[PDB]
Ligand binder design. Sequence first.
Ligand SMILES: CCCCCC/C=C/CCCCCCCC(=O)OC[C@H](COP(=O)([O-])OCC[N+](C)(C)C)OC(=O)CCCCCCCCCCCCCCCCC
Ligand SMILES: CCCCCC/C=C/CCCCCCCC(=O)OC[C@H](COP(=O)([O-])OCC[N+](C)(C)C)OC(=O)CCCCCCCCCCCCCCCCC
Lengths: 278, 279
Amino acid sequence: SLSPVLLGIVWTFLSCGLLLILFFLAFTIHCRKNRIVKMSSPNLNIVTLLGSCLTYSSAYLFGIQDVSMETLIQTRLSMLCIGTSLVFGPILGKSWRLYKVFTQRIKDLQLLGLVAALLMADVILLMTWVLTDPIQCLQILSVSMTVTGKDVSCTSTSTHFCASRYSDVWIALIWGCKGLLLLYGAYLAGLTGHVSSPPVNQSLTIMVGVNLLVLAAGLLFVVTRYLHSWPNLVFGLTSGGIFVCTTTINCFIFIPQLKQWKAFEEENQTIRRMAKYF
Amino acid sequence: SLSPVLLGIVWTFLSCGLLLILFFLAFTIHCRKNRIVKMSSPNLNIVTLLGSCLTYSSAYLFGIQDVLVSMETLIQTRLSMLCIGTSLVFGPILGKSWRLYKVFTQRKDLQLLGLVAALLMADVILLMTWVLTDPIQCLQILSVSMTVTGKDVSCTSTSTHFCASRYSDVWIALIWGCKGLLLLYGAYLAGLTGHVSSPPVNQSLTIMVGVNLLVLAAGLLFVVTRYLHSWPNLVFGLTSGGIFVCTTTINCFIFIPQLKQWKAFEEENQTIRRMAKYF
Ligand SMILES: CCCCCC/C=C/CCCCCCCC(=O)OC[C@H](COP(=O)([O-])OCC[N+](C)(C)C)OC(=O)CCCCCCCCCCCCCCCCC
Ligand SMILES: CCCCCC/C=C/CCCCCCCC(=O)OC[C@H](COP(=O)([O-])OCC[N+](C)(C)C)OC(=O)CCCCCCCCCCCCCCCCC
């Protein structure tokens, strides 16, 4: 039921995003010991890039329709939740470390432990969601007689959807926990405001990321809920929102590093040129 | 409909909160030239207290049930009052934080009043669009559904009467979304002014406590209103308690330090007056 053209366009965009993420991974693994890369916590960037990979994979999984379907939907939604937690944890840890060293001074292990607890919260919520009530797909046909007190109307609808019995409670939980995390992250971004350079100070990236996150989540929640008879629109909007948010966050993280690195080695090459000239 | 004991208890608690807001308003207006009050923003504190009054008033309206047999406009007005009251409570705090940040980062109440006026105009245009496009309708629907799984088939008979909008989750996501973006910017502002001055002038702790309590209460009350419509006492008590807790906590965090630092100032004044009388 999905157009091949839209599928091809979305897959090409997601593959280009994955290639960009892999390029950033190669850059931050190869140039680990460089000053510009080393001062930007290259170990905590691996977790962000891994979460970005998970988010892109879930965006891919959002595009297959027919074939169970419950396992597919749970898999892609849990992949999205895990990937976004892994993307946003390291940034918050970096901001917290910058705040702590600035304010009357943290190893990578403690930050990774905090990120692991953050991930465990999501794992607990997803596990209790999957076990308490799965996302079983039901074919619903019914006849409804509407009485508003002034007019009588009758309608017969045969609808099919994949959802939980109490899906809004799990929604409100996941949205709520992520929102508390984002509020604390915005507080951290404010605290480490104009405290250092962009590659070290992850403050604009946090604000852009949380704003895009809230906007995309609201839009896609509404669109999935109500425009379910527009499969191409829902698929395109979901994939575009995931792609835009992930690509924007990763670009904000890594482009400053790339340009500062280019300037650093250009200066080193000029120094070597001067040494060779004499 | 609703138990008289729960109604009485909720009304007592809301009345006590409203009297506390009235006392804070009297303190702000009376001592508007005092140094501790003046270095705060009494004109903006008045707006915060008026928003608190609106939020306390809406909690009373949440307890009216099976009286206006008129029920649609009651829900519309109680929810619009909550939205406007939250805007009026939180806008002034953000304006005070922004003014503090801009004063100490250099290279005014009318401007902040204009900013919060725009903030309230956003909610006004959202609420007007909600009412005019998709208003609440109190409709009774009886229906039978033949729920069939991959291998199992069952039938159910449901007859329900609820007052809600046709595209209710659209307006929910919109208002929740705009409020959440403003609260994210408020958290950013609280971070920017994290340790810039004292709690009477600095509003970081009040902002963070308020946004956390607000998100938690809204998330709880959305779910319980949606899924526990068969528990009128529970939903009424929980909604009133959440509104009361949020408003009371925010206003106490704003105004108690003012009272503390005003009483200390007055005590110092009295001590020096007594020493002057001695000599
Ligand atoms: C950094 C990159 C990451 C950001 C990407 C943002 C994109 C989000 C799109 C996915 C969310 C919409 C889909 C909702 C679920 C669905 O498809 O329906 C199946 C169902 C709900 O179906 P339904 O209710 O939408 O439709 C049925 C309507 N009916 C009338 C029957 C009720 O899912 C559930 O039951 C709930 C599952 C919760 C699991 C978590 C979801 C993924 C979380 C990813 C975002 C978390 C981070 C951001 C949080 C926001 C900021 C605080
Ligand atoms: C500082 C003090 C203020 C904080 C007080 C926080 C308490 C909030 C409790 C009220 C919200 C729950 C009620 C939801 C609407 C309802 O009653 O159902 C009628 C209906 C929804 O009904 P329903 O969907 O819940 O039940 C019917 C289910 N059915 C299957 C039929 C759909 O309301 C609407 O249609 C939406 C109207 C939106 C108007 C705005 C609501 C009030 C706004 C107050 C909170 C804003 C500030 C916080 C935002 C979040 C933080 C970023």
